[PDB]
Amino acid sequence: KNKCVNFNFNGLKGTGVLTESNKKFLPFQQFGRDIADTTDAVRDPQTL
Amino acid sequence: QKLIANQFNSAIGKIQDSLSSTPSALGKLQDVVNHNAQALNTLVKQLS
């Protein structure tokens, strides 16, 4: 966390900084999105 | 002279109220702000 790295969550390749998020997610919701339809919030597949 | 100085001061005192009460008195300047933001939202939103 807090470092520019390459992340790969189930095939969502990308580059960015991963920080802890307090965004409430409904148990059905897996990933968030912003206005430009780009992923800005992810759920770790192993550690919830 | 005394009357003319009074008329000027009353005229000044109404300007403070006129702009405050009327909402669309500064519509020309608010148009500059709105057009700039609307263009950038359209540019961002057009990424989907």
Swiss-Prot record, chain B:
Region of interest: Heptad repeat 1: 1-48
UniProt function note: Subunit of the fusion protein that is processed upon entry into the host cell. Mediates fusion of the virion and cellular membranes by functioning as a class I viral fusion protein. Contains a viral fusion peptide that is unmasked after S2 cleavage. This cleavage can occur at the cell membrane by host TMPRSS2 or during endocytosis by host CSTL. In either case, this triggers an extensive and irreversible conformational change that leads to fusion of the viral envelope with the cellular cytoplasmic membrane, releasing viral genomic RNA into the host cell cytoplasm.
Protein name stated in the entry: Spike protein S2'
Protein's gene: S
Residues of the whole record sequence present: 920 to 967 of 1273
